[PDB]
Amino acid sequence: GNPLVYLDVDANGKPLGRVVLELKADVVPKTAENFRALCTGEKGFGYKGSTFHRVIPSFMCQAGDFTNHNGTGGKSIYGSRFPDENFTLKHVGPGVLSMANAGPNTNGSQFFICTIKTDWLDGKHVVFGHVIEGMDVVKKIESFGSKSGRTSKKIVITDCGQLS
Numbered sequence: 001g002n003p004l005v006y007l008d009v010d011a012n013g014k015p016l017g018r019v020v021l022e023l024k025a026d027v028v029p030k031t032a033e034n035f036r037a038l039c040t041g042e043k044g045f046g047y048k049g050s051t052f053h054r055v056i057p058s059f060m061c062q063a064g065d066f067t068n069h070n071g072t073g074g075k076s077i078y079g080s081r082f083p084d085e086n087f088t089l090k091h092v093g094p095g096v097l098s099m100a101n102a103g104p105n106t107n108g109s110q111f112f113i114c115t116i117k118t119d120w121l122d123g124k125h126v127v128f129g130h131v132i133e134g135m136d137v138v139k140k141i142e143s144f145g146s147k148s149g150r151t152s153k154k155i156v157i158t159d160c161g162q163l164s
C-alpha cells in the first residue's frame, strides 16, 4: 500500500509528539518516493534535524529546507529540483500535505501541511498526501507561527522515518 511516514517534532527542545503522513504513491509515485526517502534519510540526507521555518496561522506550516533552513534551499533525491508530477489531488482542507515551490517544476524537499482549505494553490502546488494522525501537533506548530511566517519557537523535526 501507500507509504506511511512520521515526523517527531520539538518546539524549543520539548517534544510536541508525532505527525503521521500517508503518501499518495498511487497518485504521485515520484513525489511520494522523494518524501519517503527524505524521511528515512537512506540517500545520505533528509529531514532529520531540520525545522519548520515558515508557519502562518490559518494557512499552513512549512518545512523541509534541510540545507539552508530558511526557505531558499533543500534538494530532492533526484537532483536539486524535479517537475510537477500532476495536480490531481486538491488542497481540500486541513491536513493536506503539499510541495512548496518557487514556480512551475521547482519541487525540491520543502513541503507544507495545510491548516485550512487552500483552494487557490490547486494547479500550482503538488498535493501528495495527508495527515493520518497528529493534527494536534500540527495545531501546536501553527500556534507558534505569525502573519509574516516567522516562528516564535524553534520547531525541529528531531526524528523521522517510515512506518510502512
Ligand SMILES: Nc1cccc(-c2cnco2)c1
Binding pocket: 071, 072, 073, 074, 100, 101, 102, 106, 107, 108, 109, 110
Ligand atoms: N524547492 C523549493 C521550494 C521553495 C523555494 C525554493 C527556493 C527559493 N529560492 C531558491 O529555492 C525551492
